[PDB]
Amino acid sequence: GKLSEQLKHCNGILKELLSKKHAAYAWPFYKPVDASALGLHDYHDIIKHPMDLSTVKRKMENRDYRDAQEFAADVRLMFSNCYKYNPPDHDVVAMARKLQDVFEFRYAKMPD
């Protein structure tokens, strides 16, 4: 079928984190960081699962996800790799924490 109920809810949640409403503190996760330009030539060493919301949606669009748990897995993996790289005293972790809050309650309202 074209996106099961759980997966459709994923489409909506992802869409929200991608909406300009959150963009002000969601842009770090829209697309993968420009590590080479950022001076971060050690990015692929630390980040073993480089994932972003666009790729989460991409994979969702290819319907490679079976359930919203797989979505949750991939989206949270994005926030997870952020915490791997950036120490607690950085913008991207504070933005990750806040965006984690919204996404958390989005999935929390999502019934399974």
Binding site: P28, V33, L38, G39, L40, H41, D42, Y43, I46, K84, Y85, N86, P87, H90, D91, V92
Partner: peptide, 12 residues
Amino acid sequence: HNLLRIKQFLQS
């Protein structure tokens, strides 16, 4: 981690 390298997101 302890440090390594920090993302250049300082005032972006």
